[PDB]
Design a protein around this ligand. Sequence first.
Ligand code: HAS
Ligand code: HEM
Ligand SMILES: CCCCCCCC/C=C\CCCCCCCC(=O)OC[C@H](O)CO
Ligand code: CUA
Ligand SMILES: [Cu+2]
Lengths: 167, 554, 31
Amino acid sequence: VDEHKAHKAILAYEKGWLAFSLAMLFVFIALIAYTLATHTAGVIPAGKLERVDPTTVRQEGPWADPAQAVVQTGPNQYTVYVLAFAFGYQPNPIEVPQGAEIVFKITSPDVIHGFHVEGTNINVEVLPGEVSTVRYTFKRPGEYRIICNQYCGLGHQNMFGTIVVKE
Amino acid sequence: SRVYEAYPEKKATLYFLVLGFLALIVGSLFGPFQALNYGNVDAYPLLKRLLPFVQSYYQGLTLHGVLNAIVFTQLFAQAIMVYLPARELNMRPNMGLMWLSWWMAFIGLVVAALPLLANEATVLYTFYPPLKGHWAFYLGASVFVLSTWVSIYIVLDLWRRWKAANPGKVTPLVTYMAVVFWLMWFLASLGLVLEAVLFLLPWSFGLVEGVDPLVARTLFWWTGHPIVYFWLLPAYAIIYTILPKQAGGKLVSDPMARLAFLLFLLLSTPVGFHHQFADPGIDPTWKMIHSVLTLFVAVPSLMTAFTVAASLEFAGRLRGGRGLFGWIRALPWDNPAFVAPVLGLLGFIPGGAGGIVNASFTLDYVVHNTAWVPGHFHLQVASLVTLTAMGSLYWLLPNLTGKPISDAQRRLGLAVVWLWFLGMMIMAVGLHWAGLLNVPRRAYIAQVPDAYPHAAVPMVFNVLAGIVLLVALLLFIYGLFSVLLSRERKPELAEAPLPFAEVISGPEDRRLVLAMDRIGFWFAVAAILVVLAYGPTLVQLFGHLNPVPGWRLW
Amino acid sequence: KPKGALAVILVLTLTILVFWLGVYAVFFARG
Ligand code: HAS
Ligand code: HEM
Ligand SMILES: CCCCCCCC/C=C\CCCCCCCC(=O)OC[C@H](O)CO
Ligand code: CUA
Ligand SMILES: [Cu+2]
């Protein structure tokens, strides 16, 4: 009968659909998997809990002197201690060699900011009393804008920084 | 009215509905102004003459999010998912509690409301420490939400009272939906509750000096994902149990509907790191774990897609449409209670597809905190959920009140939902696009007009949407008020039954229902996945509290 | 056979794949 045939054929179609559906989600997971295995992985924050005092960051330690916050920490590896604060970045600008592994280490002395480097996959929350750590290699020389993409108060929409990537 | 004497929950439900729709109107007035902003046109000077308590862009945005995404969604979840199970079972709720829940919601709304208006908690709807709002906000929000705890008890009491009266019978379909819906929400709310009582409230009271912001987001996004399944499921309930009959047909499968709901119970809460992909000091492995589980929670939706589409194709053939597409024509495009939820489901196609991108860990670095995100969720909550809610005005208003809907009223409603739908799709394009071009959310971009010059095209779309949606909003306020300010009453309207659908049933149905009906077993499962998902991280982060002082920057 | 629902789920699947694969492309481009 109509309705009894409907239901059997509906359900027989719904059974395959659900199976195709699983298959696809599994392929998606595999393709995510691969990203984790490659250099594209460095943009993922470190899991390490690395706690500071937001209250002294500006007075004591590798955040305190912006004109020294670039440190050769490997053969072709540099560390940059970044301050995100209301409403700007330091150092400004961040100048870095083309082609080296850059390991950013961003903290905040006030509220949560974003650290989002335009044209890149660097897009990290920046919480006070914690260090965000992200690695990357700039393949092109030029100027790259930092945009603050977390609501941090009324100065939010003018919170911009600069990376200069040197030839 | 002798109507309300027999059936008092009718009057309690209606109280819920109105407060929600009031909230929604005020909420959505900020909307076209935020779209204009996203189109580089600053309309705020204007709005502030008209509404001079508004001091910033970011105050409006806070009122918008809180008033639309939290108040209206909850008060609607409350009206639908208490009333419908009451009327399926032809049984009465505990009226004392029903009123109590209402008073809790009204009191909390109004306490929360006061610092929002006086500009003392411009912290947005996520209220992320160390941005420190007025204590009254924290206390407001808290009582508002906890009002749902009473709701939960009311429906479990119903269930229980029905089961004691019917031993050996299976749970009827609607009350099934509501039961697992309320038990899921109970699990899901404990993050924010826990965030509220050990952190926000004591800190805003100045009884402790700082909050650790990483624990706060963590507990927050505990509740934060599954608060969106809490918005969605009432709409889904309507779409499965009422929309069939309004289209001309039947729901094709009770078992498949139930399995949808049960997988939500199981999978809606243990998923929050998808909101914390770019957060430091949370383990990459736990992020992946959450991402895979985020893909599973999409399966009930994929499943809902087939069940509902097969349902509409059914009704359509039974209405004379032939061929691959003729069935679509045969449906009742004259009836607003039909068109609305359906155009809603349409926009949910691109909106669910964006949902899966965002889900996929590394891919999130492209879109996170860009315009893409508000573009994604307007399709989901501002169109599917809201479109369904407005839709139900067209059968629910005359079934609680007795006031008839004219032919004219009906024709305006059709205009309204069309324009709302079209305005939302238009804004999706804009915001999706601006976001791929790195345009941030939560930003008064109109105030830095040379900052995003590469996005001038996508900006044209957001100016358009803002206009289309202004008109839709205006014809909705006028529409809804013409019904609610109507003198004419037919008490025989308030006395009809809700338009529940018939179900096609099949031999497999029985053995399947009985499984899913082992509710305690399924709830304990879902509680288990919660402890496992969040458990090892919370112990980490609690073991290592780094609380920091609060700031007021507005 | 529910030809109609099948055409809808076809549409569904296609949008999903264009979104997901199109964004995968951008990821490695920015990488
Ligand atoms: C009700 C409200 C919402 C629903 C539902 C929703 C669905 C999903 N979303 Fe989303 N979303 C995310 C991933 C998902 C996934 C995986 C799903 C899934 O549940 C969706 C699965 C959906 C489907 C598989 C679609 C089913 C399609 C159907 C059902 C249509 C059938 C059509 C028919 C029948 C019509 C055709 C028939 C005719 C007759 C014409 C992620 C990632 O993990 C973020 C973090 C983004 C970031 O970077 O910060 C996020 C951000 C948000 C935020 C912002 C939080 C903030 O303020 O920062 C909100 C409010 C939100 C709302 C909602 N979202 N989302
Ligand atoms: C006339 C209709 C509406 C329009 C024109 C509109 C417009 C907008 C726009 C452009 C934004 C982005 C603002 C920003 O990120 O800076 C936004 C944010 C938001 N909208 Fe809507 N909206 C409307 C209705 C709704 C509805 C119905 C809901 C929920 C049902 C909703 C919930 C939200 C939420 C949760 C946010 C984000 C809150 C935040 O970032 O803190 N809106 N709205
Ligand atoms: C009936 C068929 C059944 C079996 C078939 C299942 C389909 C396999 C799916 C995906 C392959 C994964 C591809 C992994 C390779 C990724 C490489 C890549 O895309 O590299 C680009 C990038 O630029 C480099 O860094
Ligand atoms: Cu710093 Cu927004
Ligand atoms: Cu989520």
